[PDB]
Design a protein around this motif. Structure first.
Motif, mmCIF file in Angstrom:
data_model
loop_
_atom_site.group_PDB
_atom_site.id
_atom_site.type_symbol
_atom_site.label_atom_id
_atom_site.label_comp_id
_atom_site.label_asym_id
_atom_site.label_seq_id
_atom_site.Cartn_x
_atom_site.Cartn_y
_atom_site.Cartn_z
ATOM 1 N N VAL B 20 -66.988 108.610 -24.852
ATOM 2 C CA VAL B 20 -67.054 107.365 -25.587
ATOM 3 C C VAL B 20 -68.483 107.185 -26.085
ATOM 4 C CG1 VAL B 20 -66.689 104.881 -25.530
ATOM 5 C CG2 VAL B 20 -65.244 106.343 -24.113
ATOM 6 N N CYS B 22 -71.090 104.669 -28.485
ATOM 7 C CA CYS B 22 -71.387 103.425 -29.173
ATOM 8 C C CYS B 22 -72.872 103.444 -29.529
ATOM 9 C CB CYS B 22 -71.008 102.278 -28.247
ATOM 10 S SG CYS B 22 -70.708 100.707 -29.076
ATOM 11 N N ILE B 43 -72.177 99.322 -24.644
ATOM 12 C CA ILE B 43 -72.516 98.553 -25.839
ATOM 13 C C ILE B 43 -73.962 98.040 -25.795
ATOM 14 C CG2 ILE B 43 -70.109 97.875 -25.978
ATOM 15 C CD1 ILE B 43 -70.789 95.105 -25.147
ATOM 16 N N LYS B 61 -68.899 93.772 -32.478
ATOM 17 C CA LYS B 61 -68.444 95.139 -32.647
ATOM 18 C C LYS B 61 -67.062 95.145 -33.281
ATOM 19 C CE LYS B 61 -71.913 97.254 -31.145
ATOM 20 N NZ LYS B 61 -72.612 96.467 -30.109
ATOM 21 N N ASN B 65 -66.655 100.962 -34.497
ATOM 22 C CA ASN B 65 -67.953 101.197 -33.856
ATOM 23 C C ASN B 65 -67.833 102.038 -32.577
ATOM 24 O OD1 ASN B 65 -68.647 97.808 -34.654
ATOM 25 N ND2 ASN B 65 -69.671 99.522 -35.616
ATOM 26 N N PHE B 66 -66.621 102.203 -32.059
ATOM 27 C CA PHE B 66 -66.377 103.022 -30.875
ATOM 28 C C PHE B 66 -65.788 104.377 -31.253
ATOM 29 C CE2 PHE B 66 -65.829 98.571 -29.532
ATOM 30 C CZ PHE B 66 -66.787 98.505 -28.552
ATOM 31 N N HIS B 80 -59.741 96.400 -28.706
ATOM 32 C CA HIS B 80 -60.742 96.408 -27.665
ATOM 33 C C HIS B 80 -60.730 95.071 -26.957
ATOM 34 C CE1 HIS B 80 -63.462 95.149 -31.177
ATOM 35 N NE2 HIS B 80 -63.915 94.283 -30.300
ATOM 36 N N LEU B 89 -60.430 100.070 -24.386
ATOM 37 C CA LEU B 89 -60.243 100.363 -25.792
ATOM 38 C C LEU B 89 -58.819 100.857 -25.993
ATOM 39 C CD1 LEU B 89 -63.526 102.391 -26.339
ATOM 40 C CD2 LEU B 89 -63.127 99.969 -26.853
#
Ligand SMILES: C[C@H](c1ccccc1)N1CC(=O)N(c2cncc(Br)c2)C1=O
Ligand SMILES: C[C@H](c1ccccc1)N1CC(=O)N(c2cncc(Br)c2)C1=O
Lengths: 302, 301
Positions: B20, B22, B43, B61, B65-66, B80, B89
């Motif tokens: 993951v 970010c 984050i 976010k 963005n992920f 999310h 998520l």
């Protein structure tokens, strides 16, 4: 931070383990492509095991006398042959989960992960070293035979051990995947014993280097020594000789900590002569010798 | 025979590990069905560490963005939310390798296997316990956050730990899979510190019972103790109190060896007083407290 006895992830090997039954004997096999590998003693009963003639026992068996189960599914045996102390059973179906692999023979002092299994079903994983006397200090009950040891060297599984038997002192003996025993053992019920063991010097130094990296420093000293002087001391304490090859191999850890190998040997000298004076190192009151230089680098960098 | 710190086979959990990302932060996530679970501090930036307002960081976010990567493949994030200290998520594809699973919050003293991972790829597997001070003594580098702890007590995976952070003493803190921390810890870089650790008495006794089972008897004696006198002595060596629940729990090992719990307790008192005088027990020069009663039964008989 932290330092732990760490095994390779076992998933690629889990998807190769199967149950093999011959008569009333059930044990574990390794299913790679269309061949299942297992100890040849699967074909022996109690009486037979006393003094087996494997050639003779095998020719009396049809394919259908080997029941092979992968999960709930039966596999059809279509061919059978022997290589040293391992039986190779040809099956009708290639293993769809067959990983990239090789058979390798390891040296005493090298480590590997063991996936312990019972009835073709994996139960646990742990890390082992091949002892100088060619035994391993494992954990195995009845039904564990055919459990395997391995390293993962990229995406490639390197199979190095198949479990055959327990010795009277509660340690373990087995073969490479070409069925050659490690150590002077045979697959029969006769009287066998582990020779006296020694400590794996190079691994102890690697573990000392790991302790330094994790902020354990009390055993460092101002002193250094030579290879020969140190080896005179090692022999006395039932440690393996240290060679120039060992020193080279430790080079990375020496550079990363600013402790030359022979300087670290001076620390080990002192620990052997004087003991630990109440202190521990990475949580241990004894000197650990079941991590290789590579294992230390791998866990303290990778 | 033999006795080893044994982890569960890790393959059911390997099939769930993803990366993951970010911003510039990459860590591990756990992909089960169509949800990916990871630490919410993914984050947080350079700034955010000291006093993060997660609700405020999250509202800014979007899904895109992920970045989530499973092996070669990107997953599309389609939703999310936050639950305590984990981000959940929602993704566009259910994990086809999702095992049968449940989330369980464990008690201090319980053991579990850790799959240490970096960049969503598994690196190693080892056995850990929840210490009395709610920390674990793991092995974890930068990028290990989101690695998980688990048991497999049939074909079902019980997820019990997600790794969040390292404390200054080099021990490790994390949450259950509902994002509640074990212990008083918070996902914030403030001065916070592990309470003093104690030894897990019930586990040490279990391990003594294991050494008996494997043929090792030298540390027994002819004495007994009351529960209370045993606890008064144990506290002086920084051992957890033993409770009646602990005693009940050891019953099966007592029956299998013919040694009453309080008799084994008497033996532990003596070992604490004397140490081992050069002897080992199952290969240890110290008393091991990271095997549970259940773990001993599982590995021994
Ligand atoms: C008797 C037989 C054997 C003797 C000599 C050579 C080969 C096999 N077996 C069968 C069996 O299951 N194990 C075993 C293996 N690990 C741990 C444990 Br406890 C037991 C053996 O030693
Ligand atoms: C700095 C940050 C953090 C601090 C407090 C609360 C939450 C996150 N991280 C990120 C990271 O990777 N680790 C970590 C985890 N295990 C072992 C090691 Br060495 C480092 C952290 O503590």
């Amino acid at each position: 931070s932290g330092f732990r006895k760490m095994a390779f992830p076992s998933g690629k090997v889990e998807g190769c383990m199967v149950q093999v039954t011959c008569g009333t004997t059930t044990l574990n096999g390794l299913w790679l492509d269309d061949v299942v590998y297992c100890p040849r003693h699967v074909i022996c009963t109690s009486e037979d095991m006393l003094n087996p003639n494997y050639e003779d026992l095998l020719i009396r068996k049809s394919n259908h006398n080997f029941l092979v189960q992968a999960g709930n599914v039966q596999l059809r045996v279509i061919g059978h042959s022997m290589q040293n102390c391992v039986l190779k059973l040809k099956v009708d179906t290639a293993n769809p989960k067959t990983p990239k692999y090789k058979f390798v023979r390891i040296q005493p002092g090298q480590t590997f992960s063991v996936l312990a299994c019972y009835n073709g079903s994996p139960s646990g994983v742990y890390q082992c070293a091949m002892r100088p006397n060619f035994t391993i200090k494992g954990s195995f009950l009845n039904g564990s035979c055919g459990s395997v040891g391995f390293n993962i060297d990229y995406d490639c599984v390197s199979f190095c051990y198949m479990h055959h038997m327990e010795l009277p002192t509660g340690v373990h003996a087995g073969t490479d995947l070409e069925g050659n025993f490690y150590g002077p053992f045979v697959d029969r019920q006769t009287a066998q014993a582990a020779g006296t063991d020694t400590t794996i010097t190079v691994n102890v130094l690697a573990w000392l280097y790991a302790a330094v990296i994790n902020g354990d420093r009390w055993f460092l000293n101002r002193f250094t020594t030579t290879l020969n002087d140190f080896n005179l001391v090692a022999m006395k304490y039932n440690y393996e000789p240290l060679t120039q090859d060992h020193v080279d191999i430790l080079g990375p850890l020496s550079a990363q900590t600013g402790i030359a190998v022979l300087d670290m040997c001076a620390s080990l000298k002192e620990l052997l002569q004087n003991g630990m004076n109440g202190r521990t190192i990475l949580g241990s009151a004894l000197l650990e010798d079941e991590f290789t230089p590579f294992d230390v680098v791998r866990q303290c960098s990778g």
